[PDB]
Each structure stands twice: as structure tokens, then as C-alpha cells.
Amino acid sequence: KDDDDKLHSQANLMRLKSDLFNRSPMYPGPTKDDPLTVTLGFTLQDIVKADSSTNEVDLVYYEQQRWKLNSLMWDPNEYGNITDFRTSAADIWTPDITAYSSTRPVQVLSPQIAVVTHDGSVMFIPAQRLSFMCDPTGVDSEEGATCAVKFGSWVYSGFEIDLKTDTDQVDLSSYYASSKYEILSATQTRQVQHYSCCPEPYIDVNLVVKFRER
Amino acid sequence: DDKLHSQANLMRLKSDLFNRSPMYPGPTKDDPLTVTLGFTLQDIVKADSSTNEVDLVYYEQQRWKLNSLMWDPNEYGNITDFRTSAADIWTPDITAYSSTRPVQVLSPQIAVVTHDGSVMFIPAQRLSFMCDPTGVDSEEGATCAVKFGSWVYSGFEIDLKTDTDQVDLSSYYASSKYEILSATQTRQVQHYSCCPEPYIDVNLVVKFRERR
Amino acid sequence: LHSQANLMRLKSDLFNRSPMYPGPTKDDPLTVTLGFTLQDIVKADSSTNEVDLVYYEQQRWKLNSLMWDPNEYGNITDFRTSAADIWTPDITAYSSTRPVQVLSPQIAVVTHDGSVMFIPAQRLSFMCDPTGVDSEEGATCAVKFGSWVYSGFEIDLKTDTDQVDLSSYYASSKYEILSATQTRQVQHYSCCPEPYIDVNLVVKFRERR
Amino acid sequence: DKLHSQANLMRLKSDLFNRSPMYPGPTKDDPLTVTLGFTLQDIVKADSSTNEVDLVYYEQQRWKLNSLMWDPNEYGNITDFRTSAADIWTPDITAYSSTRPVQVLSPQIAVVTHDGSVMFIPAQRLSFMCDPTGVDSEEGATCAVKFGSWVYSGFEIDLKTDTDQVDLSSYYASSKYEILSATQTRQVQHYSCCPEPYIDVNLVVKFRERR
Amino acid sequence: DYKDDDDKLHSQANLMRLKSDLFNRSPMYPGPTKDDPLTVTLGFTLQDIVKADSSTNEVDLVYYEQQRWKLNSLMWDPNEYGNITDFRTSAADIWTPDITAYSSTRPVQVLSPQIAVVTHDGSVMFIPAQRLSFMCDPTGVDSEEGATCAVKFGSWVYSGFEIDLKTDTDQVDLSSYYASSKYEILSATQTRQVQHYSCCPEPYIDVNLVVKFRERR
Ligand SMILES: *[C@@H]1O[C@H](CO)[C@@H](O[C@@H]2O[C@H](CO)[C@@H](O[C@@H]3O[C@H](CO)[C@@H](O)[C@H](O[C@H]4O[C@H](CO)[C@@H](O)[C@H](O)[C@@H]4O)[C@@H]3O)[C@H](O)[C@H]2NC(C)=O)[C@H](O)[C@H]1NC(C)=O
Ligand SMILES: COc1ccc(/C=C2\CCCN=C2c2cccnc2)c(OC)c1
Ligand SMILES: COc1ccc(/C=C2\CCCN=C2c2cccnc2)c(OC)c1
Ligand SMILES: COc1ccc(/C=C2\CCCN=C2c2cccnc2)c(OC)c1
Ligand SMILES: COc1ccc(/C=C2\CCCN=C2c2cccnc2)c(OC)c1
Ligand SMILES: COc1ccc(/C=C2\CCCN=C2c2cccnc2)c(OC)c1
Ligand SMILES: *[C@@H]1O[C@H](CO)[C@@H](O)[C@H](O)[C@H]1NC(C)=O
């Protein structure tokens, strides 16, 4: 029965995914009538490089994203008590969380796979290398340099996508201990932006990093 | 449940526009299109005097209008606009005419479509282009220029316009290595030897110097 | 509306429908006209003897399978289409050192007589010793372009002129062009029984002074 | 005979792949062990300006799925076959402290054996976080990098090594850097993100300038 | 005339029909097996040593790799297809061997169109041009005798009992070597070897490319 249990668990998961993905149309993304709140958090692993000839700095971090869709809900009892599953991020809608002052395309360092839970909640944690606009002047001093970069939806205003953080402290517990740069402070703060282009406000999380040469 | 219906209406709308009608074949002499173009310059990242290439980060505002993208909000739950993958729709082949590397795309390829058939698409880009930065370390600074326009469509198929001749500098990076003295964007009509029909472009002209 | 419908119908008739063109053959050979418009010598690297050019490449050919009567399609005489929608020649630099980087949209123009025009802009790194670039005489380098897999029995080449177009060459390049020629050649590679055709691009250049 | 052998191989691959949906990956109810081993070929570059080191290696991965089992007697005595990695499930084994996307240096083709076991040996170049200070001394420099599933906890994917010794028998003899030691060690981690423990294999390399 | 126009049409039809008969109404070759092994002929044409990096001991080559093999499943009778004796086809339409450099340090960069030639006897010719970075210590390159480096090419996943290799000559073709390269070639050979790797009881086959080169004076 126990290998049949294994076969049944696979059948159940295959069925769940078919039901969620093949027998319901793809979620069209958030709208003003159906807005979404994405929870964003950063785990900073390394400041790899600080280029004073171009004022670009390169970070490596894990970006934790979480949201919840009614359309991704199921009753575990209908599917052999499955409460969550992993799936390619290509299979589901994902928010267009973008750095606002990048100078190169982000490079993805991890597999793009999300965890979907039966309450319709999704957790997706892409590791990234980012080059962004930053003047490292002062990095070779006790006080160090300070740079900042905003992350938010590119195409969705606050009326479609809102953001939140669970804390305003960037997680430094995994920061590389032999980095060329030591972290003096790293914060992540929700902001409401008004851009002259657009009558609607855009929400971002402002990552502010203060750092110096070790 | 109202949220469920809103979703159905939007899915229904996109299906009607995209699955139940063939994608537009692009503009023609009999159905020409005007694309409105504007630039927001964010950074002059690098100026390489060994190769005379300069690297810009900007975003390009593109807007156009297609009758084939129109709908009556009243028959789709009063949906007035939606976001969609740029792959779902026709987009103009707006190209720099003096790039030295392929453009690097810095923003999601997603457009906004409105019920009157208008489309807005705002790609952010890093561009290397032909530019001699001689004088950048002087009070007068350096001046370079780069033309943007359709690669394959003449002025008889795609016209361009700008809403202003001033490049938007309000988001220019205040700690760039280079400060901007001026940045203009100006529609030009060109007659190239190759071709009997005039081509249209927007000439981005930037005057910049080493920040002091 | 009518014009749009006419163009969709034409493309559908040509593509979605009529039997397919499988590329040229000995029994159905093709001539491709090639020309170059040199825009910039970006870089000359004397440590590796590689030089980087930016140019566009004008390609032209004609297929009976792409012909139509404008009168049957509301007097449409040409259209733009994705290069992926049609056959295109495998024109290749014979001495590149890096993959070509494409700088322009991959879209071609098809005309009612069956002619296709395709003008890809490229950045190319190729084998070139720039020795002498810092002298009055300058350096000279050459690179051959032609089909990779089709011999002259399947693809022949020609030029409309042997002068490279320099009328868009960047006036403030690090390098001045002294001359640039594009010349059809016939190659007989001991590798292969049939002759290969190429257009040889020869560029004489020097540091701007 | 040859046409028969081919027809049989085609039939097997059909019955296995196109005659069920791809396996949905491991779960707590249907967990998997990946055996992981490294063969280090070269330390290409050590950058003391950014503290990044570049390694070239082969990563040996092995796992077993009941759903990939067959009776060779039903398929003309076929006991194993090669197939594109895209045709089958593969584990999301990831370096935890890379600084650039891994670059794949070998074909993405696996070997499947009739007992359901799969062997997949991707060659990679990896840049990862490493301070090379001391590389020009007798004791050399030591760096480490953890490899593990990105999204599956130890309750879904276990890892194991057959040996804690990295295979150095193909290490490039004229590298800029010589290897003093290289070990690969299973670890269990408890991350605040996640209630369930994660498993990794920690690669520790001690290296020095080859003089 | 009209006859000539028709002949061309018939030729196009005949080729489309041949490709369809081979590719559409037939199963893609599942690759070689111990029961159905395959011999691939490999040869190199070295065009340039582009660079020699003594800071990392990587050297970069540009070459053409000629590959040839033959399958019964690609055979046809030309008389059944208007005397068509060969055709060009995308390398994606056919099976191709996984010939790989065994000491690359970067992914190979492909410099030519991925198109093969298939002949009515079932033989296939495929000639990818590549830029390769590989492990090579160029110490001595500034000497009369130069530096020597080597790199093995072979199937990644198939042993010698599935994919065997051969050369047609022991000499790398230097007839189109770049005359103004930074490096002159002193010799370049290509030699079949048999390897025994601890992973696997079956022997593996490779062709070893050995190049002796020096800075041009
Ligand atoms: C598609 O293309 C063709 C063009 O080749 C086009 O067909 C042409 O239509 C024009 C306009 O009707 C025709 O021109 C006429 O020719 C006759 C002689 O045959 C003249 O008598 C006509 O002149 C009178 O009418 C003019 C107004 O139309 C007056 O200005 C003038 O004073 C005269 O009263 C006129 O020039 C022409 O014959 C055809 N040509 C062919 C080859 O058919 C067709 O109309 C185009 N299709 C569309 C939808 O536009
Ligand atoms: C007149 O100049 C502009 C400048 C920027 C934007 C859009 C922006 C910039 C702020 C971030 N998001 C957007 C956006 C909004 C919707 C789709 N794509 C991009 C614009 O569109 C209305 C016009
Ligand atoms: C010397 O002979 C030539 C030179 C250039 C072009 C095209 C150009 C030049 C630059 C503007 N864009 C085009 C174009 C036109 C149509 C398709 N693709 C590109 C040409 O074709 C009409 C012939
Ligand atoms: C000096 O020795 C040579 C010369 C030429 C070629 C091939 C060529 C010439 C360049 C254009 N294409 C080919 C080709 C020929 C057949 C199939 N694929 C490619 C060659 O291939 C191994 C060796
Ligand atoms: C110190 O802060 C940490 C530590 C570990 C992880 C996740 C990891 C560890 C590496 C393996 N994969 C994951 C993971 C876990 C869940 C989903 N996706 C990825 C993390 O995510 C934000 C923060
Ligand atoms: C010294 O340690 C070694 C030697 C050889 C191989 C495999 C090789 C040799 C190169 C060609 N391909 C393979 C291979 C074999 C089987 C499956 N996939 C790849 C190896 O893989 C972990 C370690
Ligand atoms: C759209 O709005 C109009 C008035 O604003 C209303 O009469 C109509 O019911 C709405 N149509 C819908 C929701 O389909």
C-alpha cells in the first residue's frame, strides 16, 4: 500500500496542478478592483564590487517575495491532504519587482521555483546579482559610503500592487564575513512615490546600505 | 465574488482582442501610425575615450493607438485599461541608429492598453553608442548625439512625434560621474541615399561633463 | 480596415498556405546581392589582433514563391515581416572571433516581384592585425562573408558596387577609413568539391589624427 | 536487428515519458535522495579585488525514481539509455554563495538505468565568494561553498556523499593554483526562513599559488 | 519557359517531400547504443590562437570542427525524389553527437550557422566553427620552441561502445591559419585516444588536439 501511497501522492499532486493550471484560465494579474499586496524582504549576502570610475556597485542578495491569490486556493482534503507544493515560477503569475536604478540586467543566481500553499499564498525567493547607481566615495573611511536603491513594480501603481515589509531591517545574518566591504547598516523601507509621469503613486521598498572597506 | 467577475471580464476582454482576432500586421502607407517618443535620462554610466563609446541608462516612453485594440468598457465590466505582456501585442521597432552593442533591457516587457486603443510602453535600457567624450573634463563639456527611429518603416508608415523637445532630467542620478548640461530630443526628417521615402527619427543630443 | 484585411490575407496566402520553399538547390539556385555600410571601427586590439566593426549588411534576393499581383490585394506592393517568417541566407563572416551581435530588428521587406531586402546591423569582432594603424599608411585588414553551407551551385553572390558605403561612417571614430572595398571571390577549398562564393571586405584604416 | 533495437528504445522512451505526465518532483510523502560528488578540474582565477574565485568542476548527481523503472525483458534487453535532461525531472542543486550565474560547460544529457536510477554529470564554471588572502604562503587560502536544493528541505530531498574527499585525479596539473585539500561534507542547516531543515554539501578547498 | 518553371516547382516539392518522409513520418533517431554504435569522424581546422592568458592559464582558439557520421535512417533513393542527392537542414532537425571539449573553462561560442548536410547514403556532415577557452599554461610562448597545450574532445555521455571516434588525418588543417595572428603555429596534431575513467567500466574515446605555438616575431 505504501508504494501505492507514493503513487497516489504523485497522482494527487499531478491532479492538483492540472486543476489549478489547466482547468482555470491564467490569473490576469492585479487590477484596481482586485489589488494585491506583495511582502518584500532582502537578505544581503555580499557587496562584491564598488566601481568609483562609473559609480556602480554590485550586490548579491536573496529577495523574498510573498503574495496570496484566491485562485491558487484548494482544499487539502480533495487532494490527499497536500498542503503545499513547489512549482516552476513560469507556471504562475509573479510580480514585476524591479530595481529602479539598475545599470545592468539583474543576473539570477537561483532556480526560479515558488512554493504555493493551500490558502493560495506563494513564496518565491530569487537570488540576484545587481549592479546599481552608487557613488562609493567615503568607502575608504570610518564613516563609509551610503547608497540606496528602490524596488517596486514597474508597471503597476499602488492601486494595483501595494508592498509591505515584515521588518525594516535587512537580514545581515548571512552577509559574507570576508567580503571586501563591511556593512555598517542596511534598512528596507516602504515608500509611496509620486512620479511626474503618472497621476497614481507607485510603491517601493527602499534598500539603504551604509558600508566601508574592511 | 465581485473580484472573481472582474477577473473573468478581463480574461474575456484579452481573449476577444488576442485569441479571437489575428495580430495587427503593422502599419502601412494606407494605415500609417504615429508613435510618440520621449526619454527620461537616468545616468551617463561610462564614457570610454579609448573607443569613443558612451553608456546611457534611460527610459523610453512610447505611445501609439490602434483601432483594433478598442473596446467598449460597458460590455467588459467597465474595464478601461489593462496591463499585458508586450509579446501579446504589436510594438514599434524603435532602434538607436548608432549603437555599438545590443541594448540591454532593464524593465519588464509589459505595456498598458486603454479602451480607446492607445498603448503605452516604457522600456528602460542601457545603451552603448558612438560618442567622443573629448572635452568632458572641461567647463564646456562634451556633446554627443544619437538618433532613434523605426529601422524598417519609412515616414509613410511610421511617423514620430515628441510631446516636448526637453529630455526629462528630473530622475537623473545626482551622484553620477557626469553632470548634464543639456539634453534635447528633436524630431528629424531624413532622406537617405538608399531609399526614396524619408525616414523619421528623434535625435537625442546630450551635453555633459565630469562632475566637480 | 480593408487595407489591414488585405495585408493579413496576403501574408496568410503567402505563408500559412502555399507549398514551402526549402532553401536553394542545384536545380533552383539563388543569387544574393550583398553590400556593406560601415559605421565604425570601435576597437583595435593589438594584444589579440582582433578588430571590432559596426556595420550594416544589405542582403537582397528574389523568390518566385513570394510573388503576388498587387491588384488582387488592394494594390499592396510590399510589406514588412519578421525575418523568422521567411527563408533567409546564412551569410557568415569567415574569420570572426566572437559571435556576431545583432543591433537591429530582425524584420525584412518583401516586394510583389518576390524580392526580399534584409538589412541587419551588426557588431563583429574579426581577425585583424592593426600594426601600422599609428602611421600614415595605416593598417589593412580583410574579412570574407558568404554562405556557410551553400556552395556557388546553390547560392551565388554579387555586389551592386565594389565600394563600401562610408556615407554613415562615424565622423569622430577613433579610426579614419582610408579605403573600404567589397569584392566577390570564388574559393576552392580542398575540403569541398564545389566552389564557395564570398564577398571580401577590405578595410584600410588609421588612428584619427 | 538494429532497427529492432531502435524501435525498442523508442518504445521504452515513449512508455516512460509520453505515456504519463512528467514527475511532479519529490514531496514529504515521496522524498528523494540525491548523491552528490565533485571532481575539481581547475581554479581558474582568484580575484583579491572583489574576493571572488572561479572554479571549473564536474558535479556528479544521482537519484532514483520508481517511475523510471522498467523490465529490460519487455524492451529487447535494454538496461539503460541516454536522454536530454529536459526530458526528465532534475534536482535544483544550487551553490549558496555564487556571485555570477553558473556557466554550463557540458551537454545536458542524463543516463537512465532500468532500476529507475539517473546519473547526470554537468560540468560548470562557478564564481563564488572567496577571500584568497594567504594564497601566496605555505598554508595557502581556504574557501568554502555550500551546494543544496534551493526549494526542497531535508524532508523532501536528502543529500549524501559517497566520500568526503573531492576527486582531484583530473585536477589541471598546470593550473595557476595547486590544491592542498578539497572535501565535500554533508551538513544540516536551520534557517529562520523555514521551519524544515535544509541539507547541503559543503565544498571546502584549500589552495595556493603553484610555484 | 513554362517547362523550366515547372521543373523548379517540382524540385522544391520533391525536397519538401523527402524531408517530410525522413522527419515527419518517421521517428527521430534515439541516438547510438551498444547494440547500434556509431563512429563519428572528427577533424579540426585551426584558424587562430586569439589569446594566451598567463594570469589564468587559459588560451582561446578559433577553429572549425568537422564532424561526420552515417545513419541508415537518413538513407533514400535519389530516383524516388527527382535525383536529389543531398540537402541542407537545420542541425535541430537531426540527431547530432555531443562532442565536447574536456577542459574548457567557458562555454563554447558558436560562430557559424547550425546547419548540416545530409547525403542520400545517410551520411551527415556538420562543421561548426567555435571559439573555445581552455586550460593551457602559455609559459614559453615567448621562446623559440614556444608553449605546448592540449585539449581532448569527445562525447560527454557515450562511451566507446556507443560512440567511437576516428580521424581521417593526424594533422590539424593549418591551411587557413591566420597569417597575422599574434601566435605562430609550430605544430598541431589530432590523435584518437582511449580513456578509462574511474566512473565507468567502459572505455571513453577522445581526439586530443595538441598545439605547439609561439609569439610571432
Ligand atoms: C490599383 O492600381 C491601378 C493603377 O494601375 C488602378 O487602376 C487604374 O485606375 C485609374 C483610376 O480610375 C484608371 O485611370 C483612368 O484611366 C482612364 C483611361 O483608361 C481615363 O479615362 C481616366 O481619366 C478620367 O477619369 C479621371 C478620374 O479617375 C479624370 O481625372 C479624367 O479627367 C478622366 O475623366 C483615368 O485616368 C486606370 O485606367 C486604371 N489603370 C489600370 C491599369 O487599371 C486601381 O484603381 C488601383 N486600385 C485602387 C483600389 O485604387
Ligand atoms: C512622460 O514620461 C513618462 C515617464 C515614465 C512613465 C512610466 C513609468 C515611470 C515610473 C515607473 N513606471 C512607469 C510605467 C508605468 C506603466 C508601464 N510602464 C512603466 C510614463 O508613462 C506614463 C511616461
Ligand atoms: C545601400 O543600400 C541600402 C542601404 C540601406 C537600406 C535600408 C536602410 C538604411 C537605414 C535605415 N533603414 C533601412 C532599412 C529599410 C528597410 C529594412 N531595413 C532597414 C537599403 O534598403 C532599402 C538599401
Ligand atoms: C582550410 O580548410 C577548410 C576550409 C573551408 C571549410 C568549410 C567552409 C568554408 C567556409 C564556409 N563554409 C564552410 C562549410 C562547408 C561545408 C559545410 N559547412 C561549412 C573547412 O571546413 C572543415 C575547412
Ligand atoms: C539568512 O537568511 C536566509 C537563509 C536562507 C534562505 C533561503 C534558502 C537558503 C538556501 C537554499 N534555499 C533557500 C530557499 C528556501 C525557500 C525557498 N527558496 C529558497 C533565505 O531566504 C530569504 C534567507
Ligand atoms: C577523474 O574523474 C572523472 C573522470 C571522468 C568523468 C566523466 C566524464 C569524462 C568526460 C566525458 N564525460 C563524462 C561523463 C560520463 C558519464 C556521464 N556524464 C559524463 C567524471 O565525472 C564525474 C569524473
Ligand atoms: C458600467 O458603468 C455604468 C455607469 O458608470 C453602469 O450603468 C453599468 O452597469 C456598468 N456596466 C457594467 C458594470 O458592466
TrEMBL record, chain A:
Species of provenance: Aplysia californica
Annotated residues for binding of Mg(2+) 1: H8
Amino-acid positions noted as binding Mg(2+) 5 in the UniProt annotation, renumbered to this chain: E160, E200
GO molecular function, one term: transmembrane signaling receptor activity
UniProt binding sites for Ca(2+): S173
GO cellular component, one term: membrane
Positions annotated with a glycan in the UniProt record: N81
UniProt protein name: Soluble acetylcholine receptor
Automatic annotation (TrEMBL), chain B:
Binding residues annotated for Mg(2+) 6, in chain numbering: H191
GO cellular component: membrane
Glycosylation sites: N78
Sites where the protein binds Mg(2+) 4: S154, E157
Entry binding sites for Mg(2+) 5: E157, E197
ATP-binding found in the keyword field: no
Annotated binding of Mg(2+) 2, by residue: D81, E157
Disulphide connectivity of cysteines: C131-C144, C194-C195
MF terms in GO: extracellular ligand-gated monoatomic ion channel activity; identical protein binding; metal ion binding; transmembrane signaling receptor activity
Binding site for Mn(2+): H5
Residues engaged in binding Mg(2+) 1: H5
Binding site for Ca(2+): S170
Residues binding Mg(2+) 3: D81, E197
Keywords: Calcium, Metal-binding, Receptor, Signal
Neurotransmitter-gated ion-channel ligand-binding domain location: 22-209
PANTHER family assigned: NEUROTRANSMITTER GATED ION CHANNEL (PTHR18945)
Name the record gives this protein: Soluble acetylcholine receptor
Species in which this protein is naturally found: Aplysia californica
UniProtKB/TrEMBL annotation, chain D:
Annotated Mg(2+) 3 binding sites: D80, E196
Residues that bind Mg(2+) 4: S153, E156
GO cellular component, one term: membrane
InterPro entries tied to this protein: Neur_chan_lig-bd (IPR006202), Neur_chan_lig-bd_sf (IPR036734), Neur_channel (IPR006201)
Residues noted as binding Mg(2+) 2 in the record, renumbered to the chain: D80, E156
Chain residues that bind Ca(2+): S169
Binding-site positions, Mg(2+) 1: H4
Gene3D superfamilies linked: Neurotransmitter-gated ion-channel ligand-binding domain
Tree of life domain: Eukaryota
Binding site for Mg(2+) 6: H190
Keywords, sorted A to Z: Calcium, Metal-binding, Receptor, Signal
Cystine crosslinks: C130-C143, C193-C194
Residue ranges of domain Neurotransmitter-gated ion-channel ligand-binding in the record: 21-208
Glycosylation sites: N77
GO molecular function list: extracellular ligand-gated monoatomic ion channel activity; identical protein binding; metal ion binding; transmembrane signaling receptor activity
Residues involved in Mg(2+) 5 binding: E156, E196
Binding residues annotated for Mn(2+), in chain numbering: H4
Keyword Calcium: yes
Protein name according to UniProt: Soluble acetylcholine receptor
Organism placement in taxonomy: Eukaryota, Metazoa, Spiralia, Lophotrochozoa, Mollusca
